Amino acid sequence: YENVVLAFMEIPTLRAAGLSLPIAGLEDIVTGLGDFHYNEGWVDGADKAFTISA
Amino acid sequence: ALLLTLFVNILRLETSLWTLPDNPLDISEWFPFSLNPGNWRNIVKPFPFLADNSP
């Protein structure tokens, strides 16, 4: 039972579909990465930040 | 073992609701209108299990 319950989180994003970005020409045009993209990235856990706020 | 471990995480990333067969990497299980892979970014190449001679 230890580290089974509430031990992991996945947080999604709008990056694939589209967003405005703080880059010249992208501030008012919705653009996304495309259907082909990198899927996941591990947030580093050595200081336990995810237990204060994920 | 590696291709199934990859495939199970591809199913997760394409958010599939498909029930696993007894062997998920047998192509005979993927059709008709079963796996519905037509929109996917990534897939595993299926193969017959009795021919796999890897250690």
Side-chain angles (χ1 to χ4, degrees), chain A residues 11-46:
Chain A
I11 293 168
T13 71
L14 296 180
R15 282 187 168 164
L19 288 179
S20 306
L21 290 179
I23 300 182
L26 306 186
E27 312 97 317
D28 64 357
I29 304 182
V30 176
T31 61
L33 289 173
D35 291 351
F36 296 89
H37 52 252
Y38 297 126
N39 292 300
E40 303 183 295
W42 180 263
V43 184
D44 46 312

Side-chain angles (χ1 to χ4, degrees), chain A residues 10 34-37 39-40, chain B residues 9 12-13 39-42:
Chain A
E10 191 214 329
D35 291 351
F36 296 89
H37 52 252
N39 292 300
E40 303 183 295
Chain B
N9 288 283
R12 176 183 67 76
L13 288 168
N39 201 47
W40 295 4
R41 282 67 61 78
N42 278 284

Side-chain angles (χ1 to χ4, degrees), chain B residues 18-37:
Chain B
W18 183 71
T19 298
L20 290 188
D22 296 350
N23 177 15
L25 304 185
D26 180 16
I27 195 168
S28 84
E29 303 289 3
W30 294 16
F31 69 88
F33 306 107
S34 172
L35 185 64
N36 297 349

